[PDB]
């Protein structure tokens, strides 16, 4: 089963396979993102690219409000025009590599909808805690 | 009840490791111009914070001879040095045939120099003029197999050509604080009895080290730090005759050196605008450059180093002997003084002995009675290997003095014979790693391992 | 008490002391892990090392699933062979500096067990939220 | 309303306005803090310094215990001497730019009080979970 | 030659005053005075923000 | 040496600035023919230049 425990799938071993299996073992794609040691100025620049791009990816995952932040649900509706495809088709049949080609046309809107919804939730939760 | 792994972050744990340390210096150096002195430009301003906090319950093993940080400092100094002499004038029109005149003044213990006249390319690059300048004898070599005793060459040009040190930078041993980078820390031994290797059972932590002196000195350690309570001896393995032995003092032995010769700085022009500085006339009487040490204090310090050598060699008296001999820069006490670089014949110091019982200097006949060392002086300096291996130190116009403190000795045990009761030690410490190794003896860098896992009675709520 | 409030223990003041006290004041060992300013290429290489190593330590602490991420419990049982030592002996008598020598032989297995258990918990929590 | 949704206020569009409105749209001041690409050693230092300063700001927000970490309440009481000003005056009338001039005299004490209180809460929560 | 050695400008580079946008690094911003009446010092009571000049 | 399929090189003698910067000596070294070009329009078949 995909719940290997002693997961060994390297950098990208979940690629190509069905999204139902790739939903597990996300950590190997996340854990590996930082590595390397120094040579000169050029590969020092290469080293900073990993750091800065990773922290950018964490900015996006942070202002969207994830808790246990490598999977989190959201309150923004899936406007069906974004996929117009069945849930079972997306998760069981398709793969993440192919799914990138579908949603990538529309990501920049979702990346702000999640932001504003999370900020709304933050203020509302502070208000509820004050009322409590 | 059952135990589950519980992870803690912010956890005090160490690994001794290699790291790239900062260079830090005091704030008073930063109002000056660029690289005057280098600490103003190539190092960060320091901060006294944090305090020298003490980790009372700790025990940690320290080392000096497997220590990486002294070698890292050596590399830092060498690389900075190449960076510092890069913009200065490259010379190379000085290797013209120097014609050096004889003199009717009687030779002897006066350190007479050679008045050498030579052709230079003036500011008109494709035109020349005759120019004269006085060079010390060690700077000068007879020309070639096409022998003429009146014609000479600089000691370079048998070697990669040499670069003058710009007068805009001065090579004072400015204190340098080395600091571990963020995420690392430096552990400082608090026990004064540390003997070079093994556990310091009482340690302190600091982010920045003492204001380490980057001092250039061969046979004696100049302006260095001091031990808190007792004279100390340090060596990787005293069994070996080849390994250097460091000695670190409780109180300093004052040393004063000087040029009584009153040089005048000549300003020769070499090609496009750049100037070459050289010694002009000796405006004054010719006199011997030398060094001084208070004789009774040196005797006391040497006999006390004798008692400390007896702790490792109990059944023997200690004899001190002349230096190793051979190369001038190795056998002599070479050190920096005000801009000039002295080379002293220390055979007059290391000539006494310890009888196994302290010989009293009290009551003192005269505390200002001095032992004198008569020192050569070089301008062309072959400081290090792989630094470009050359400096021309320009002469500075005055009868200078560099009254300073001795705080350590670099001896070396001579070859044994007959298991003799009097087996001897010679000054032979050549490498400048040992100078900083004698001063960085308290310190080690630790890599923080802040992520630890331990058991306790709790499992994640689900 | 170890609850000093105005904690002043510098970088490492808890080292050597009992782990019962060093369990408190973890923040000083964590807060101090970033500092320094410019000197050329070499110090810049030193500076990037601090940031990258800190982010690595945050990767490990994040994929393991901590909430309030400087202490968290886990659901992975302590296979006793990792210590074979009493809980009171570990926490009261002994110190963290010594505990490094015990567990360091076995850390690399725990660092993956926590990962797989956390990812399992993430998927199970999303499933439970879907069923709710 | 300030709940724009498609927020467009750039780097600092909430500056000057009342704190009641600036309490929302905090994300644009937070999202924009990483950007740029390389030119030489001099600006590579600028690129690294932005990442380091951000991570420092995250150290402070992390050891204080924020969940949903761009707004979080704390258990440290507001010693009134820090402002001696009405809540409605602070939030409705004043602005963040002006409020900096008030609290900045005293920030360094709060930055340690939150630290010690959060670490206290962490140990207490572990103890309660153990008792549960 | 009453001065340090001097160097020719290579014809492969031309010294046109090309426009240069100075930009603050990430985490900093540049505030731009919008009031045309600015006299070199003192408060601009109307300001704009730009990442690049 | 007789020409042919033997790849004979040219024995070139030239003045060098010795260790003494403003003194010179005649020195000889053999260079392959592709490294060597005849001098200039001030033509002399016995005088040559490096291909740089
Ligand atoms: C060049 O040589 C002259 C002497 O020919 C130096 O001047 C003399 O220096 C001595 C230093 O010992 C002065 O004596 C006194 O020294 C004590 C230290 O024990 C100090 O406390 C006194 O206040 C005083 O300075 C002496 O007065 C002075 N002048 C003469 C005429 O002897 C000169 O210092 C040398 N050049 C340089 C740059 O040092």
Author numbering:
A (entry chain B), C (entry chain G), D (entry chain L): 512 to 547, 569 to 664
B (entry chain F): 32 to 139, 150 to 185, 185a, 185b, 186 to 309, 312 to 321, 321c, 322 to 354, ...
E (entry chain K): 196 to 248
F (entry chain A): 136 to 139, 150 to 185, 185a, 185b, 186 to 195
Paper quotes:
A glycosylated region near the base of the third variable loop (V3) of HIV-1 Env forms a supersite of vulnerability that is targeted by antibodies originating from diverse germline genes in multiple HIV-1 infected individuals.
The upper path from I2 leads to the I1 intermediate and then onto the mature DH270.4 and DH270.5 antibodies. Mutations in this I1 subclade were generally further from the antibody-antigen interactive surface with less clear structural impacts. In I1, two mutations with possible impacts on the LCDR2 loop, N62H, and R65W, could affect N332-glycan D1 arm interactions.
